[PDB]
Subunit: 506 residues, 4 copies
Amino acid sequence: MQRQFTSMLQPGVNKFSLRMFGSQKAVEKEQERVKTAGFWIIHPYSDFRFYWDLIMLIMMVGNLVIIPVGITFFTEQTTTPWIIFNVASDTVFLLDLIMNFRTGTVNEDSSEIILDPKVIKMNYLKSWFVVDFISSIPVDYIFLIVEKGRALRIVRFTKILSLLRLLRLSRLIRYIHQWEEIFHMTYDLASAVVRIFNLIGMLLLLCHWDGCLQFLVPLLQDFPPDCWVSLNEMVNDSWGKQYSYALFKAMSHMLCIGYGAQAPVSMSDLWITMLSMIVGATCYAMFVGHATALIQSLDSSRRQYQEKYKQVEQYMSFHKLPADMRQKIHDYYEHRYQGKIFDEENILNELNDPLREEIVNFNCRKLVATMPLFANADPNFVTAMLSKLRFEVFQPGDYIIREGAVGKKMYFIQHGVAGVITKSSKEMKLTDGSYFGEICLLTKGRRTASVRADTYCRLYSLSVDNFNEVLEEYPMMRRAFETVAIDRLDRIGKKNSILLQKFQKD
Amino acid sequence: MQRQFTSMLQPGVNKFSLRMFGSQKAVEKEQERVKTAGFWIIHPYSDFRFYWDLIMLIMMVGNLVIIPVGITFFTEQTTTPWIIFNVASDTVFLLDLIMNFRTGTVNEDSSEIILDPKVIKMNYLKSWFVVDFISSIPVDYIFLIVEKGRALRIVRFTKILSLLRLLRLSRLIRYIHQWEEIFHMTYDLASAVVRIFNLIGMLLLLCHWDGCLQFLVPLLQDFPPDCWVSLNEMVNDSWGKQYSYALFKAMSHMLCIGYGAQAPVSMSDLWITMLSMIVGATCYAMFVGHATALIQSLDSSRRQYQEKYKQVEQYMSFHKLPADMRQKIHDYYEHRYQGKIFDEENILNELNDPLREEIVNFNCRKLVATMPLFANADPNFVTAMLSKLRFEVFQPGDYIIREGAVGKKMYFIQHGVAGVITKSSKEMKLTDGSYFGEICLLTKGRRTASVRADTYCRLYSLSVDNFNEVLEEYPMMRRAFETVAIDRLDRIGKKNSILLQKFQKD
Amino acid sequence: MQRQFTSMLQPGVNKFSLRMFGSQKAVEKEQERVKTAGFWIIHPYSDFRFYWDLIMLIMMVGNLVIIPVGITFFTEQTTTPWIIFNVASDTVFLLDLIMNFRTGTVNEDSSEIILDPKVIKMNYLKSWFVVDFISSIPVDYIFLIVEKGRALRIVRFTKILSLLRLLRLSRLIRYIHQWEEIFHMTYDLASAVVRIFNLIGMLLLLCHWDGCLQFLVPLLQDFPPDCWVSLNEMVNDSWGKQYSYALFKAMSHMLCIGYGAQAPVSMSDLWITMLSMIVGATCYAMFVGHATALIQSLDSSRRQYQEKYKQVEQYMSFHKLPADMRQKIHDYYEHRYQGKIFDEENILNELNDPLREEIVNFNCRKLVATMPLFANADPNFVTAMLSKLRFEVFQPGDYIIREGAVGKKMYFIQHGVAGVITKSSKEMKLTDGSYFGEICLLTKGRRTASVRADTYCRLYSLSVDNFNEVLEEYPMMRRAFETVAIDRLDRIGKKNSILLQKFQKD
Amino acid sequence: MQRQFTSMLQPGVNKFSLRMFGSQKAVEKEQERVKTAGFWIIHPYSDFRFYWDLIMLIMMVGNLVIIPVGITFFTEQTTTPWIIFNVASDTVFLLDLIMNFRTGTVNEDSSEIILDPKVIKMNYLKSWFVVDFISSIPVDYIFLIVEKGRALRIVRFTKILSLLRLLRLSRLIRYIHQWEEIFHMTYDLASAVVRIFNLIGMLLLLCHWDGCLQFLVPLLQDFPPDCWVSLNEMVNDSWGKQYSYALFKAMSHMLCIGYGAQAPVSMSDLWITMLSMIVGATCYAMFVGHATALIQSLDSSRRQYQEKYKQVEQYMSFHKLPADMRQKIHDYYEHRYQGKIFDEENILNELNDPLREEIVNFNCRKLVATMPLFANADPNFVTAMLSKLRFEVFQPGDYIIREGAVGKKMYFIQHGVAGVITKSSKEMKLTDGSYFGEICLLTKGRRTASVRADTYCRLYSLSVDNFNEVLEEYPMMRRAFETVAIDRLDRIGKKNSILLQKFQKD
Ligand SMILES: Nc1ncnc2c1ncn2[C@@H]1O[C@@H]2COP(=O)(O)O[C@H]2[C@H]1O
């Protein structure tokens, strides 16, 4: 029913509307703002405005292609099918002029949309209306009717008047730059791709119009004996032969190849050729510019990784490091970053709490399932530890811990193997999902066995200040870490007295 | 009166003068520095200096266009209108040489302006004066007068001497690069735009001069039978026909199209053509360079947003995240930044206190009007809270708070809806302008109800260390937050005893 | 034995496999995942897959070169050696189609490899299979056999059908982009180098195919009197003469030089020429793009140093600094960075503990050998100091210390000379490997002698908060620093009483 | 005497030597390392090595220009002046081969210079020696002597052999890339400038050699009737006519203009032309690349300021700020940075203590002279305050202080005027060199008068934590600030009792 048509002129509820205004409670307020204004106003983001702009764009490219050819290569632009086509394609561009008095303008000053008739009618007439009117009315047929109540000059002047219809190109530029931002906001296609597909449309269009101009000036001069058409003896050839040749001549100038058969011979030809050369050669330089901007946007991640790693060689060479040590540094960069560039501490800081909580669970589900102390704890404790772990990598043969130092960290093994070493201990191994380094952080003493990486291993580490911050909020968990610690100190025979005293009569 | 003319040579009070010197008390000191020097000195930023440079620029472009044509395509450069024009356009360029002995030089060493006659007269004569003198005096008419007390060689040598007037191009370059910096400091037009509009002027000028040189060498050789003018049989054609052809030949070399009618046939033509090809092809490569520099400056913001967001996909793929979780991360980036790139904590830190105080009020006038605790407080308290809020966004279904955790934050709802959930509570809702999370920060206990986002919502958050820092300076406000808190704990039935005890007999 | 062949289809243990999966325990798990699937599956990183792709690439470039020539410049493509060659080079491209039903696809969604037959057969047939089948079967000989049970049109149509074999270019693009990533991950060649060597292959190939197309259309039209072959009178010349000319014509369009002998004369030639001009001129613009991307990647370090140092002149000119002070600042930047750009505090922070411990030893072995207090200490103390030193540089004549200030630092001399100055002290010198500034940090008092650089010297410095943090963990070392300090205070005669009292009866 | 010649082969003491090694004590050690080696060794940075490389470069460019012409355009390369010139220019390039067995190689591995004869003789013969020998000996005259004990083929083969002398270009490339780094380290000319002046040398040289090749192949074929020389009828013209034409043809291909008179007619010409087109068009694309790299390095500072300020408009538009507030923000950025981009807190942190102390005095000599409390203090106190000041700017009408707030800062007026306002106070003014805000920091109370900017003013500010840190080290200075404070509180009548009590009986 007609109420579904009355709903087509107000703003919609597609994801663009939500991105521009926020929640549905902002969209439904702006939707009433329209309905409570004057008798009809079209919202610039309405489905009606958007389908109208597509109907215009599809028809307007057709008109900017056909009109130059129908003016240039034909006599009798007052015959039946041309009178029908130019009348029909005048009405739609005149309805478009009417609807621009009743469309709400977006403001570059970032306000709410102007959305009122007395503001819109004043804002439009002070801008594009002078070009929009001249390009809409049939000035050539109006002039022909006024002059209707020797004669060959009238056919030349009405040809020159009819070319005012090319000013539609202003609407093609205005409607693309608005319609493009809606698609570019919603569908995320890259800047240089969109800019190139606009510029390829302009190159072909300027080239097509030049390929008409190069024949139109000879025609308005009545084919003088010195011009290219008369020297090539092609005044009476079919229109497709003449057009194919004039377009070849026009794009030969643009791509800088030559000028067709021979160099210009007359004054008109000389000055049309130079204008075409300048417009062509300055337009192809803008294409080389956009091609360069495209190519440099595509390798961004690879380039930034190379530009980062080249800076490490500046440091290694300034300190004059040995060639085997350079290899350990180069190899570590492959195992820690896998050729990808990012800054984890910068990205994780822009996300809110509940995304950061979800990502930091997914990286660690192997520990949470495999390791016994997390597997039965309250989930508000497990998320209090996993949010404070930091990620580290060790190469085979490196010591993570040495005996007789102090403090700072403990480690959980995400992947790989680490060995535990002490006097008279023989040897011992820790696999994936286990943890080490807790004794120094509980007892406040020195370290009691060395630990060494047996394969390329991924560890998560927890610092002494963060470890106490978690356990002070959950004192039931400290007893679990202590009742594991006292058992490990029994196997190694170290039997430390302060922890054994700290457990008694709990 | 004449004192208004004597005031024209000293520095003005337009916004450039204030930007260079600071307050009016610096400008009025420099204005006396001029007046207290020698009998007359012109300040380089004076309105007289600036209108004199415009009179020169407008006339100097006219001379560098007309002089090559009047030398090349004409005999009789001693006829009445040429004697009048070259005399008149000699006097202004000789007055310009006089005023450069009395203009204060700007120093590249960033000092005060040199502004003294014995320093200026020594600094000028050691630099451009040798080129400025040769380009100002009528050397060709002086030579013609000296030789005045078979003959065809004198007309050739006086043509070659008269081309010394093209050295004016040094003044055109010097005066543009100074005059441009005043406009570029005051009106803020972008680097590549200004640099392109300078280079387009040089391309057309070099092309025009080459289009004269290509005919001048044939003329000084008296049109030998092998040269392009004699082979094309155009020795006696009108000057406009000859010039249009010679310019077409010159720009055909620059844009690399061909060489006109046919390839060179003589020694002079061969070496003029190659010089023109090298100057042309190296000059068009600089245009492609500036076109590339322009295009890459225009998409800066879009590009940097793409280059930022591409780096998040490096992180999500390194951690091998699931495809539905990638969608939550992608969607959050659209709701928090709306496709715009900036760093709020870096920009706000460069502004002074009273700008930062004004911006942080404008973002929050909705809270300050709608919420009851700010609406009657002292404005020095309200500005003490709003300056410490941080901005956060939550997606629908995410928990902001869970029961049985601890501390850190409280939240004010700028836009959207949040629901409050607890055992036997049924359900409850908070709308725009309200606040939650205060109970944990006042009581120092654990949380007492969960809170969950019901629509895409914008929150401002306040941390526990900043919350106590404000309330310690305004103890009257803590009573308001507590007398709301005790009422909310009654509705949920939790009735916490420490806060109820803390209120008694105040 | 055949088990070594059955081992060729599973993943290997070369450094790429370790980089993709981690330790050998991840590789050996994926290696069983393959063996435990269906009867045969080829892993995409297998040595069999990689040698098969090389056999295809080497043969496929040969086919995309020979096929256009054998179709264009020859009659009798049913003669003995062509029947042998096209049959043989059909079988290998049909075995390749069979093995793509049994190769595990890599997933762009970063999962484990799909590695199952029912998933692979469904994923392939929904994508490239339609082009892979058409390019593999001998459609021209199949059509010739079907039609085998006036005639000149069949030879033209079988020429047009046989060009379906050029769709192999899709396999050449697919196989390069996978095979390249393995080499680019393992051997680290830069982005723009690899991208240029791909594009040079496409330029020569498009140019070769265009050089066939430019003759093929005349041949399919039976050499009409208006076309370039008939006007140049070369219908009966040897095939090498015709091909050399048609390739010259094709690359003349691509590099924008001309069009061979003369401009086109017929409708076919005009539209083939314009298509060749557009494909050529848009392809050469992509080469200028990649050449620009290469050149800007090579000077990265030099450029960034210039772009950094230019920013210091913005600061020195904003503060209007004197010209001799600018020279001290310029000279300091040469002695501290030696023209190399890096950020030491950012690089050292990405490395793990045991690399950072090794680099910070290598920079200081001169101190550890030459200076007496480190040379006999426990290595866990020496590594506790060297990990907290910071690096500084001083110009000759600058004071490092003044008498009568307080605290902050002490210094170790890596290289150069410093002099010690005090009232009635005469003069005194410290050489490489010595240290100064300890008295203020031990006694908590003020400084007691000035110190001044006598040559461009490199110092390591230690801050007062870090100095106490080390000595609190190793109280035996504080006695060494104190028993040196009390001896130095005796030579200068200052004899400070608090330190002398602090030593008694230890 | 000869000892001054023996000193020419060891390293010097010019600023490059100091930049590479550090102090003179490193240079004088390396200088002995040379003298204590084998009988003679040339150090690569010696004045002898550097003048020898200049003698080679100047002569080698002369040989790579003359040799192609003397081979191509002349018969009788065994005549008197050619035998003299080729013998002489063989000896110097053979002495150069001898001295490369006795020059110390720089190592790309950043070690000390290899500087020993058994290492150098092994390292050279495994690299460039094969090309250095072939390019040094007169192979053509050796072959002519061996063949010396119908004949026209010997003159063709000795022409082809004599072109081996062009391999000298390897020495021209090797010697430039070493000699350039010494100048580029010492004199600081920008990357793209140096790279362009190298590439312009290669363009002219390749173009010159191509202009010889284009005539040499016709000559070795004995001028066949189809080639360009015979069609242009110029077999007997003077050598300058032939060379000028062949160079025009060669650079017409490089700059893509045409191919001279007409398109190629024979097989040799066709394949020489295409090789010249490919070498030319790929070499001009590298010039457009370097021209783009030059132009983008020159506007670096202007561009970065625009790219910074464009990011502020992203922030102002995301918050939808009013248009008058945007103007205050835009205007503040002009008064605080004056269109220059830097980060003061990053630059000042890279300088050592005694530079940072000197710069921070020069910015403040106006305060230190004009203000009474600094003007008589100990210089170790004045440098303890000035090193902790921060710089701020305020627009006219903004409040710096409001009554009834608390703490944080005090201010010193570098330039401009500020007014002091209170109830019943009338009005009061502070000029340049005075200070305000001390009462709140001494008394720990609230503020007691408002302060407002009366002109665009520059302030230095000091924070409460830094203020107490200075005064605790210099308790005599706190009495000065207090004895000013108590006098100011008397003028305003506030008469605060805690400070008045704190002064009694000192
Ligand atoms: N026998 C053991 N079995 C397993 N782990 C042990 C054993 N003995 C010691 N450890 C661990 O080795 C760690 C070495 O560093 P810490 O002494 O701080 O803590 C030690 C324990 O976590």
